[PDB]
Structure formats: C-alpha cells, structure tokens
Design a protein around this nucleic acid. Structure first.
Ligand SMILES: [Mg+2]
Ligand SMILES: [Mg+2]
Ligand SMILES: [Mg+2]
Ligand SMILES: [Mg+2]
Ligand SMILES: [Mg+2]
Ligand SMILES: [Mg+2]
Ligand SMILES: [Mg+2]
Ligand SMILES: [Mg+2]
Ligand SMILES: [Mg+2]
Ligand SMILES: [Mg+2]
Ligand SMILES: [Mg+2]
Ligand SMILES: [Mg+2]
Ligand SMILES: [Mg+2]
Ligand SMILES: [Mg+2]
Ligand SMILES: [Mg+2]
Ligand SMILES: [Mg+2]
Ligand SMILES: [Mg+2]
Ligand SMILES: [Mg+2]
Lengths: 109, 139, 252, 175, 190, 201
RNA sequence: AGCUACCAUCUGUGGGAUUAUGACUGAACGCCUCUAAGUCAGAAUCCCGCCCAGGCGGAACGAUACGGCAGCGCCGCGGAGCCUCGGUUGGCCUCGGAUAGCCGGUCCCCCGCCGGGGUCCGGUGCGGAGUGCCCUUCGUCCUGGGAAACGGGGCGCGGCCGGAGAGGCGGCCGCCCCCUCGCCCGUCACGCACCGCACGUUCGUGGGGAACCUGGCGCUAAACCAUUCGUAGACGACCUGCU
RNA sequence: CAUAGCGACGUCGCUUUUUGAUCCUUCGAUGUCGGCUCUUCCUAUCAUUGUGAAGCAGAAUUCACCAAGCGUUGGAUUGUU
RNA sequence: GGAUGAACCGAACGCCGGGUUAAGGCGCCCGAUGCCGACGCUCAUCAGACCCCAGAAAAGGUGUUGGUUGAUAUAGACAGCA
C-alpha cells in the first residue's frame, strides 16, 4: 500500500578517532539535516531488514529469507541531524551505508 | 544596473534572525555592515541590524535620517506600506509558502484530487491543440 | 661520492622493454596526418626483405666533395607484389581515443588471405567468411551493407582498408598471407569510402602508393639474437682479464 | 583578558583607612570588561599602575555597569589607547561608529587583533569619547557622514549553501 | 578601507554612438566599430543622457586595487572613441649607421619585410594585427606609417616591428640601428 | 538516496565538490560526475599547473612503472582527488570508490537527464569575484591530456541537440499555458482549491 | 655461409603553454609606469608528438562442434520445479549559461514554414519556482451529475523515423481485437470484520547455475599436443608447412 | 667615480663535499683506503640554449638571471684521495 | 589529544550500562559547525596553517593595511607643461 517508514542510512558506529563503541549506531535519516528537526524521530522504532540463506519464521506469515535486527532511536547526534540508535544486537559492519527503516511506531503526534 | 539601494526610508524584508518575515524601514547606516532599523507598524523596535538578513523591497519612505518613531510611523501609515506590501507578488508568494506548509493530511488529499482532475482536463486540451496544429499542409 | 670521470650512458632508455616483439609484422602505430586537400591515396604497403646489393650513381649535391662524382652506395631490395584489398574499417573519434565503428569485408576473400584466420589450416574445414559472403548476394544483406556504408559515411572520421599480401608469388615456404590496415588519406570521408569501395577485391601495385626518389619509413622486427649478456646487449665496457667471477658483466 | 561583547563598568575604590589618613581619596575608573570580576581585576591593575595601591591594602566600594545613555543613536567614537607590539609600545587614536560605547570598544579590540595581532592583554584603553562628525579624522568613518547616503548590495553571496545541498538551479547573486 | 562609491564619466561625441551589452562596449563611429568587453572587471556601466551621451562607470565598495580600474575602463573607452572618430597613426623611423634598412610592404599592408637590417641576409617577416595597415611614408625617406582603429592593435604591430629589428651580441648603445616608433598621433588631425 | 545523483562538473571547485562526492559515496549513494573538464580550481592557472607538474615529478626512482600513476584526463584527475578523500585501502573505501563514475563531457546515458548542482562547491559563491582560477580541462590539456578538441566538438553537438530539445519544451509549455487559458471555467473549481492550499499562486 | 667492427655501411623528427627577458595599452598617483585589470614576443627547460611497451581496460569482425541421436543457438516468460546471491520499497525524458545580472512572451529586418537580431510588454528574493513538477494503489456492485466521447488498452501484428561519445534507447504510422470501464463529485451495499501488535507494501516475470517437459525456426567448428619449419630459441614461447 | 667590477672596519646567515667536538646505534662482527666498472641524483653553471649589465667600439673577457637537457676527455710521476 | 613518538597537554586503570567533560577538535579521510556565526588582514611563478616540534637572520619593498610626528595649501598647494 505504501512505504510507511522513513528511510535512513547506517552511517557508522559511535566512535572517537581511534576507538569504536559498536553497541550504539549512527543513523542518517533522509530529509533530516538539522539537529532541531530530529525531535520527531526520538524514541521511534528502527529496523535493519536483510535477507539470508535459511528460512526463518515470519510473525503473521510464512517463513522466508527476511531477517530483522530491531532497535530504536535514542537521541540526536551532531548538529546536522544525525541520530543515535541502540539495537537488540550490535549492527553488523556490512550494513554501513545501507538502509535502516524508522517505523513511526511509538507515535507522539 | 542596480535598482534597489540601501538608503534612508528604504523598506527591507527580514529574511532570518529574531525578526524573520517582517518589514522594516532603514533609518540610518552604520559602518557598511549594519543599519539603524525601525518597524513601528510591523512590530520591530528600533535597533541595529546587519545587511545580510535584509532583502530590499521596492518601497522607499521619505523621512530624514535618524528621525523618531513618530515620523517613521507617519511615513509608514501614509501611503500604507502594509497593504501595498500584501498586494505584491512577493508577499503572496510568502503567504502561499506558509499555507502550503500548514496544510493537513485531509487538505493534501483534497489537493491531490483537485490537481488530478485539473491536470487531466489541461492535458486533454493540450492534446486537442496539438492535433489542431498538426493539420498543416502548405508548400 | 660522485663518479670520478664523466661518461655518457650506455644505451637508450627510449627502448626499455628490451623484449621480444609481441608481433612479427611490425605495426604502423602512426599514420600520416590526414588533410582533405590532397587526393585520395594509401599511406602504407607491405614488402619482403629480399637482400642487399650496391649501386653506382652520380651525385648532384652542389658544394659537396662528391658533386658530379660517382659514388657506390649500398641498397636493400624489398620485393613488393601488389596488395589485395579485402575490407574497409571505419574509425570514430571518442574522448577515449579512436575506436572501430564498423568493418565491411569484400566478397571472394582469397584463399591465402583466409589462411591467416586459421592456426591449423590443414585440419580446418575452410569455413571462414562462408556465411558472411552470402550477404553480398541477397537483397536483405545488401541493404544491411548499404546501411553499414552509410553509417561509415556519416559517423566515421578516418577509414582504413584491409589489404593482404600474395604469398603465391613469393619463393618463400609460407602460404599464409599477411593482413594489414592501411589508412586512406586525402579527402572527405565519403570520397575515401567510395574510393576504397571501388578498390574492393582489387590489386594495388606498389607504384600507386610510393614513387621514385621519395623518403619513406620502414617498420619491422629486427633480427633475433637470443639471450645476450650486458656486453653484447648494452655494449658496456669489458672488465679486466684479472676479474674473478667473470668479466663480461657490469661491475656495479 | 579574554573577550565577548564587552560592558562598561564604573568602578570606584579606595585605600583602606589607616591612622595616617582616616579618609583616603576615592578613585573612579571606566573599565570595559566581559564581567564585573574581570572589571574589578582590571581596576586593581590600573590603579596599581597609577597610584600606589594594591588589592590587599585597598577595597572596591562600587562596581556597577554603565548603560549607554542613547543606544538608539548612531554616533562616532574616538578611542585613545596604547598597546605593546612585538617590538615596542605605541599610542593609537582609532575611530569607530556604533550605537553603544561598549560596542565601540569591542569593535576596537577586534580591529586591533585583526590589524596588529594585538591580544587583549596588550591593549590599554585610556580614553573613549563621542566625537562630532566634523571632528572625525578617519575617512572610513567620515564617508558615512552623508545625509543622502545610498549604495546597493552588489554581489550577494548565497549563505544557505546546504539547504538544499543538491539542486538543479544555479544561484543568483543579483538582487 | 572600502570606498562606498567611485564613479567616473566619459562624454561621447555626437558623431559616435555607444551601446552596452552588459559590460561589452560597442563604439560605432565614422571610421568603423570597436567592440570590447570588460567582464573581467566588476563595475556598473550606464548611459546617462539622450542628449549629450555621457557614459558612467561606477564601482561600489571597492578597495584600493579595484578603484584603479574605473579610470582604466574610462581611458579604454575614450581610446575606442578616438579610434573610431580619428583613428590611430603611429610613425616609425628606421635608423642605421651603414646598412640601409629596406622595408617592403606586402599584401594590403598586412605584412612587412625587413631586408638589410645590420647587413645580414635574414629576411624579417612581421605580420600586422588584423585591422592595422602598414605603409611607407611619402613625406620622409625612412618612415613607416601604421594606421588603424584599435590603439592596442596598432601599437602592438609597431612593437612587433621594433622588436623584430633588434641588435644582438653587440653594444646596443653603439649599434643604434633599428626601426623605432617616432610619434603617436591620429589620422584626420581633428 | 536510491537513484543515481548526476552532478554537472562545470563551475564547481575541485576539492569542495570532491569532498561532497566522497561523503555521498561513503553514505552508499551512486554518484556520477559529468563534464569534468569544466571543473575549476582556485588560484591562477600557472600556480595550479606548477602543482600538477610537481605531482608529475613525484615518481618512483627505481622503477617508474610501479610509481604514482599520473592520470591526465580531467575525469581521472577528479577521480584521484576523490580517492584522496576516501579510505581507499579498505573494503568500505573501495566499495565507495566503485559507487562513483566520472566523465569528460556528457555521455549518452546522461546527456538526456537532468543534472544536479552543488552550491557549496560552486565557484560563483565560494570564490571572490576578483580572484583568479584555472580550468581543469585546460590544465589537463597542457599537462598531457589528448582529447580536449574531440570532447569540445562532441560537447558542441550535444549542445545543439539540447537547444533543439529546449525549443520543443518551450513550445509545449507555451501550448500548455494557452490550454490553461482555453479551459478555465471547467478548471477554476480546482484552481481555487490549489490556491486555497497554497499551490499555484 | 653465419656472426661481427665508427675496423664497413645506413638512419636519427614536430608542436604547445610558457621561464628569464624585452615590450603594448593603462590606471593607481590630473604626469609617469611591462601590471594592478587586460595584452605581445619568448628559450638546450617543461608537457605532448615521433618513437618503445601495452591494464584484473575496451572495440569491430569471422567461425562457432552429427551423420548420427548429438551437441548447440534464437524465438514462447511456455510450463512445472530446484540450488544459490542479495539489494531495494514511485518517477522527473536533458537549454546554453550569466552572476556589477538573468528569465518569459510578442511586432519589424535576415536564413531556411523555423531560427538570429532591433523594438515593445511582462517576471525577478527565481512561482514557466528541484523550497519544484508528475503519478498516486483498497476492490467491486446499484447508481446520478460533470471531464471526455477527434478516447484508453493491446508482452496483437506489419511499416517508418530519429539516436554512434558508451547509439542497448526513443518516437511516429497502417491493419486487427476489446470495452465505453477507468478522471472528479455523488447514490448504493458488499468483500475473512482473522477478535490491539513485528519481517507488511515494490522493483520483480530480479541476477546467476544445473536439470525436466513442451513446440517452432536454425548450425555442423575450432584450439592444443604430436609432426614440420628456423625469419625464432636456455626451456617455454614465436614465424611456418602438411592429397 | 662608494656600489661596471671589488669591499677594510664591523655584522647576519647558509651548507654538511673539510676537520673537529660528542659517544646515541653497532664489539655472540654492518669487511676498513684508493682505483676500475655502472646507474642515478644535486646545483652553489665550466661549456652549450635564451637573456640582462660593463670601465660591452669590434674581438676577447667580466658580472648576473631562467636553467642540470646535454657534455665535462687522452696521458707522464705517485698506492694515493 | 599532539598523524607518528619513553618524558609534551589532559587524565592515571577492577568487569560493564547511561549521562557529562578535560586537553584537543568539528570540509573529506575521521566522531563532531550541513551555524544563512561576527569583525577585519592577506594573493605568494618556493602562500599559510597550532606548546614540546621538527627549519631560519640581518637587511630591504612606491604590495596593501593601520598608526605617530611634521610640513605645504584659494595670500592658490602637489604633480605635470613653460
Ligand atoms: Mg661532474
Ligand atoms: Mg683473482
Ligand atoms: Mg662583443
Ligand atoms: Mg659503426
Ligand atoms: Mg597616456
Ligand atoms: Mg613580464
Ligand atoms: Mg604569447
Ligand atoms: Mg653520557
Ligand atoms: Mg656479515
Ligand atoms: Mg653487508
Ligand atoms: Mg641557480
Ligand atoms: Mg635524460
Ligand atoms: Mg595517543
Ligand atoms: Mg606532529
Ligand atoms: Mg602545565
Ligand atoms: Mg561511558
Ligand atoms: Mg583531527
Ligand atoms: Mg563526519
């Protein structure tokens, strides 16, 4: 019917120059390029959706190749509209530069 | 080449800053970067203001430099700058931006429907005009 | 510290990949710059080094010691049977260089020319260009050929002719002919295409390409000498007789 | 001494009374400082230079900000100062145009830093005075004394270079 | 210091007209048309009157270096007016001690051959800039006349001739030979 | 984004555009820079040519065939500049570098598409009007590039075709304006909705 | 014979931007000034050409496997399925450009009925606007009013044209076969309404590989070794020949 | 005639092709002079290209600039540098 | 943190989650200015760019920018031409 989630990019992990804190990730939401625009997305659920080789059970559906690592936006990062996200398991490094969905679920509007 | 000038009595539109979206009059000039600025009828009290956040309009008021609020306000009210401003294409472009921004979901749906029908009618007329212009045969 | 006496370098670094040539024929690598004011002509030819001899002639060099004098000069004989034109290649200029746009081959490709397309001619079924030559007869293939020539006419900047030598006229063992793209210079693209098209299947003698007492360039592969040391390869100085592990070497 | 937007302070101090003078004289200075703590420190610096006073042997009886008596009027400020260069000390007279005296002194500090690389600890502001437009001496200040001043804004640089970051239309600089 | 405004005005004679296409000045007069663009300078050009034809050059908020360009543009425009009304004529004299410099003016005054400069057998061929005509004066025995509409083109051709006739490997204070611009003036003397 | 971002190289500053492009391709975005001969470099031409000649001088003394590869085409120069801002010795950097295409002129896949512009890299806004600059095409040509003339000829043909297409588009838009004038009694009902909600002033 | 020697003989090359420098016009600084803006000439230097090599870089073209069941190519999205790789979740089909200026439209002059100029009229914080535009997905059934009815659909055929920089694309006609439906506002009720819940929704008939069935139209080849050569050579490699 | 070419008294530097000063690396070892051979690099340019200056008439020479493309040799004595 | 580094700057250490800082930073590599940051200075045909620190002096410049002192000028300066 429609997209129903905001597009975001897994830009990278929270890090210094030479230290990397993989437990939290940095997301670049499309169209959000200022810190004051990020207040809408705080607390929203976010998902890293990908495919694999073996079938896994799908809630309310038949098993397929789709797998999800769930998470949520925790706070803003930087002045340019980055956000920080905590996922149930740390995001794999192959997902850098790939799609994250921000799901609008815990709505406050 | 230039047509709009910084000068006493020139009406400027504030693009950004604390007074964004308001009209002011230039009362005086300070050191090439700032201007003594006064909107008595647009709710901008007299203050310094950089030239970077100004966008000059076509209206020029006639009062001497560094006059008081009384004379600036009479110059503004006589030959009303508010209505003459709202009549311009600039002001109603701003107003159209504002009312497009404040449009709700139901309003977006209604605009989508109206624009759908409008575009279809216009496209049919364009096709008719194209076929009417395609019947040319002249050596 | 600096070397004590100055001496020029041995050998030229302009020929550094001092390796076996990847080709046996010797490719042109630069054709003469094309100017449309000239008449349509070919820019190169293929010959075979027969041998050397010498001649006697009188010199007409004023102010020289040998003016109006007899000289004996060595000459090389290059046997040049007529080339046979069997194809046309169009090239188009791109911001990545010249690229081959379209190739059109003539009907009736000679047997010695067809030998060039086979590594083992003896075992071959001789099938090369057999289906291609059929398109010079049907109406559809002829229309496609006309479209190819029109595309070359309107899109190609330089054109070249495929020409092959005639092994059957030479005393050599080899029967496999030599193919070559020879550039056609001197006109508009349409004019040189018409000229090359009328020369298809035809013979071009060497006197139609080169004239008397003009200076040309010869391109070829030199005589092989096998694996050689530095003394014979770069002509470095031989080390003294007292040298222990060998003297035909570069010391440092 | 660092900076910000400077403020004017009237600082009045005196020596502590002793059984040599029960009423020592009161001394007043204008200090242009970021805040009252720095203002008191600079007051002690200057009165230690001029009189034979110390922060320990004296006290500060008043330190209050001096508000501009006409912040809505453009006026010309002459500033007499001295500063240490890399190779000596020089006295300077500089002119500025501003609504506030403190703003003019801030302009002076920035301009000295820009033109002479003079840091704020090297600069000693010794006089600030509003001057008549006929008493001005700096042509960059004098050229704004036109009752019919008029100039355009010739080459207006786009400052919103990242909203949008990517666009089809190239910017216009003529307005 | 940035100066608010620096302006300079050039009067245009009645027999010549000036057209502005941005910063491209087209000056059309009795002797031809001179066209020159000043797009490398950020100034404002305007034609003021419909009566006496003033052309004003304005520079706003210019520092010392770019306030120097206003009078440069004005002088270039005045030279264009002068070229299209009176033209430019440069008179050169050939000076020599022993070997006479033989000058032959080839096709339509666009080529100059210097033959016997310092007695050497090299023939100097100098090609005039387009629009510049060289000729041999009928008033003086050793004199070239270069005539044209563009002062820069005429003087550039004169400099080409002068630099072509250059003594080398000798004391030039003693070997004074060569062709030197004697005077710069106009045609029609008006 | 998900589409290919096509950027016109004309009027853009080299390092500014290269920084923008490098960040874009590191964010997993397909970027295609066309007309790389139109890229500008701040500072006068002799200075920029001297910089590239110093780059030419830097070569491996023992075996120059292994040394730095000095690419002479403007597209390859810009590609190497972007590679200098990418972490090209890791897999992430190599993938980001793969997501970038550079061209001299505008090739047929992209001459029929709209081209974006980066204002933060534009010379007109990033450079004072009195400063001097160099053209990447001219610098490349004088430092070893061979295809300045043929690229210019093909660009001129492309511009002629684009002028024809633009005339067709103008004629179509004039016809559309005439159509809107022709049907207005049957259009004003929806025109009022659009005007009410701010579309179509 | 072969190899070989300044111990014999032959051959060895063209542009460009410019350095130093000398100048032009010209301010700054009513003069002057090679310099500030703008120009000129300029070299054993520099870069390129000529020349040597030719990328984990491309192009064009040729031939593409049997006389026996024997392999392959194209056409049908033709079917039934497997194995594997995953990304993505509407499109924009394009003036050239200037920036101390632009854009649009229109009457007279010139060039093939369309463009270029000169007017004139508009817009310019770009609204003929990428802060934009287009498409817009719940589906049907009664059922009226408007848009259209010179209209939409054809993985339907046949024909034409344009596009070569990497055209891998796009456009237009003729025949035939459908429905008067799809677009807006209304009338009318219905669909699993799966009892609050995630990976839903697209590209997509995705890419790639083996294999089965089903038809049609087509093809019948080379490379390498072995042998020979000696224009080649440590060995490989290379140039060759073989009813 | 200070400054074509030089430069006293003073004074500011650069270089690491001299010789020192030091002793950081190497004493379960980095083969220690010169020559021969061979390649490359530097410029603080001897020659050649293009220039400027002279107490540059010409010739020769001298000073300086861009400049390291190219060249800088055969011998007697000496282990020699 | 200073790219790199025994000693510099910050800070000293059990295994972790969240918040906030130091010194240092925020075009891209590379987290962070994608602020409509402020005012000036500066063009370099060897520009400049951050403690230790990793290169420079005396002496000059009619490049430009400020400042100090002095002088001339409608009783006509200054510069040009005579
Ligand atoms: Mg030597
Ligand atoms: Mg021995
Ligand atoms: Mg002499
Ligand atoms: Mg020899
Ligand atoms: Mg003059
Ligand atoms: Mg010069
Ligand atoms: Mg030149
Ligand atoms: Mg010790
Ligand atoms: Mg050992
Ligand atoms: Mg050893
Ligand atoms: Mg030197
Ligand atoms: Mg060499
Ligand atoms: Mg560290
Ligand atoms: Mg460091
Ligand atoms: Mg400390
Ligand atoms: Mg923590
Ligand atoms: Mg850093
Ligand atoms: Mg970052």
């Amino acid at each position: 019917s429609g997209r129903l989630w905001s597009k975001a990019i897994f830009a990278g992990y929270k890090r210094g120059l030479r230290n990397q804190r993989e437990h939290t990730a940095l997301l670049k939401i499309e169209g959000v390029y200022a810190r004051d625009e990020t207040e809408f997305y705080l607390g929203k659920r976010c998902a890293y959706v990908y495919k694999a080789k073996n079938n896994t059970v799908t809630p309310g559906g038949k098993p397929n190749k789709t797998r999800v690592i769930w998470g949520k936006v925790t706070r803003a990062h930087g002045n340019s509209g980055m956000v920080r996200a905590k996922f149930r398991s740390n995001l794999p490094a192959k997902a850098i530069g790939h799609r994250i969905r921000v799901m609008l679920y815990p709505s406050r509007i | 080449v230039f047509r709009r000038f910084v000068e006493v009595g020139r009406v400027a539109y504030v693009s950004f800053g604390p007074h964004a979206g308001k009209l002011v009059a230039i009362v005086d000039v300070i050191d090439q970067n700032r201007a003594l600025v006064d909107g008595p009828c647009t709710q901008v009290r007299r203050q310094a203001m950089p030239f970077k956040c100004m966008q000059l309009t076509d209206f020029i008021l006639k009062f001497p430099h560094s006059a008081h609020q009384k004379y600036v306000r009479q110059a503004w009210q006589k030959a009303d700058i508010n209505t003459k401003w709202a009549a311009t294409r600039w002001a109603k472009k701003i107003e159209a931006r504002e009312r497009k921004a404040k449009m709700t979901d139901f309003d977006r749906f209604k605009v989508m429907k109206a624009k759908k029908m409008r575009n279809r009618i216009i496209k049919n007329e364009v096709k008719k005009l194209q076929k009417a212009a395609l019947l040319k045969a002249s050596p | 510290s600096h070397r004590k006496f100055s001496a020029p370098r041995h050998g030229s670094l302009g020929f550094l990949p001092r390796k076996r040539s990847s080709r046996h024929r010797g490719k042109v690598k630069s054709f003469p710059k094309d100017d449309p004011s000239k008449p349509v002509h070919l820019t190169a030819f293929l010959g075979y080094k027969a041998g050397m001899t010498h001649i006697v002639r009188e010199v007409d060099r004023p102010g020289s010691k040998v003016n109006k004098k007899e000289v004996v000069e060595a000459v090389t004989i290059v046997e040049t049977p007529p080339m046979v034109v069997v194809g046309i290649v169009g090239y188009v200029e791109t911001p990545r260089g010249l690229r081959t746009f379209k190739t059109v081959f003539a009907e009736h490709i000679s047997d010695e020319c067809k030998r060039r397309f086979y590594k083992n001619w003896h075992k071959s079924k001789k099938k090369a260009f057999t289906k291609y030559c059929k398109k010079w007869q049907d109406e559809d293939g002829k229309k496609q050929l006309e479209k190819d020539f029109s595309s070359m006419k309107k899109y190609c900047q330089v054109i070249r002719v495929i020409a092959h030598t005639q092994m059957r006229l030479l005393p050599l063992r080899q029967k496999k002919a030599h193919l070559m793209e020879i550039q056609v210079n001197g006109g508009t693209v349409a004019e040189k295409l018409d000229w090359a098209r009328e020369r298809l299947e035809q013979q071009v003698p060497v006197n139609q390409v080169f004239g008397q007492d003009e200076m040309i360039d010869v391109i070829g592969v030199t005589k092989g000498k096998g694996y050689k040391g530095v003394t014979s390869r770069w002509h470095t100085k031989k080390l003294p007789r007292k040298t222990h592990r060998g003297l035909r070497k570069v010391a440092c | 001494k660092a900076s910000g937007t400077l403020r004017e302070y009237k600082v009045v101090g005196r020596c502590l009374p002793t059984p040599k003078c029960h009423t020592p004289p009161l001394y007043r200075m204008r200090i242009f400082a970021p805040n009252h703590v720095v203002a008191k420190s600079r007051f002690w610096y200057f009165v230690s230079q001029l009189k034979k006073m110390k922060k320990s042997s004296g006290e500060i009886v008043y330190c209050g900000q001096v508000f501009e008596k006409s912040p809505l009027r453009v006026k010309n400020f002459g500033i007499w100062l001295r500063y240490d260069s890399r190779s000596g000390t020089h006295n300077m007279y500089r002119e500025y145009r501003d609504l506030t005296t403190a703003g003019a002194v801030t302009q002076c500090y920035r301009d000295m830093g820009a033109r002479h690389r003079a840091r704020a600890h090297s600069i000693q502001i010794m006089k600030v005075e509003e001057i008549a437009a006929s008493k001005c001496r700096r042509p960059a200040v004098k050229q704004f004394h036109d009752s019919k001043i008029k100039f355009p804004l010739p080459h207006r640089v786009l400052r919103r270079q990242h909203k949008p970051r990517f666009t089809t239309k190239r910017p216009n600089t003529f307005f | 210091m940035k100066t608010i405004l620096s302006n300079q005005t050039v009067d245009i004679p009645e027999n010549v007209d000036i057209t502005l296409k941005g910063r491209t000045v087209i000056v059309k007069g009795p002797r031809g048309t001179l066209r020159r663009d000043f797009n490398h300078i950020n100034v404002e050009l305007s034609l003021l009157g419909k009566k006496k034809k003033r052309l004003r050059v304005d520079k706003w908020w210019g520092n010392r270096k770019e306030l120097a360009t206003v009078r440069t543009i004005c002088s270039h425009v005045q030279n264009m007016i002068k070229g299209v009304t009176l033209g430019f004529r440069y008179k050169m004299r050939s000076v020599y001690a022993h070997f006479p410099i033989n000058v032959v003016i080839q096709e339509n005054g666009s080529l100059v051959e210097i033959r016997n400069f310092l007695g050497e057998k090299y023939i100097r061929r100098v090609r005039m800039r387009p629009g510049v005509a060289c000729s041999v004066s009928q008033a003086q025995k050793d004199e070239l006349i270069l005539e044209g509409n563009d002062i820069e083109l005429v003087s550039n051709s004169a400099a080409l001739i002068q630099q072509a006739t250059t003594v080398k490997n000798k004391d030039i204070r003693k070997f004074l030979d060569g062709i030197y611009v004697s005077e710069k003036g106009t045609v029609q003397q008006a | 984004e998900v589409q290919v971002l096509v950027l016109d190289g004309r009027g853009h500053l080299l390092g500014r555009l290269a920084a923008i492009v490098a960040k874009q391709v590191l964010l997993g975005r397909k970027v295609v820079v066309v007309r790389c001969e139109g890229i500008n470099i701040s500072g006068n031409f002799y200075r920029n040519k001297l910089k590239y000649l110093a780059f030419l001088r830097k070569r491996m003394n023992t075996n120059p065939s292994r040394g730095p590869y000095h690419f002479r085409a403007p597209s390859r120069i810009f590609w190497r500049t972007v590679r200098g801002m990418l972490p090209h010795k890791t897999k992430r950097g190599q993938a980001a570098l793969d997501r970038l295409k550079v061209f001299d002129g505008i090739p047929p896949p992209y001459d029929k598409k709209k081209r974006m512009v980066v204002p933060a890299a534009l010379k007109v806004v990033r450079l004072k009007p009195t400063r001097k600059f160099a053209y990447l095409g001219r610098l490349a040509h004088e430092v070893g590039w061979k295809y300045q003339a043929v690229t210019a000829t093909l660009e001129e043909k492309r511009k002629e075709k684009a002028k024809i297409h633009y005339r067709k588009k103008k004629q179509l838009m004039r016809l559309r304006k005439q159509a809107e004038k022709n049907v207005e009694k049957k259009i004003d009902k929806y025109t009022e909705v659009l005007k009410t909600h701010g579309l179509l002033v």
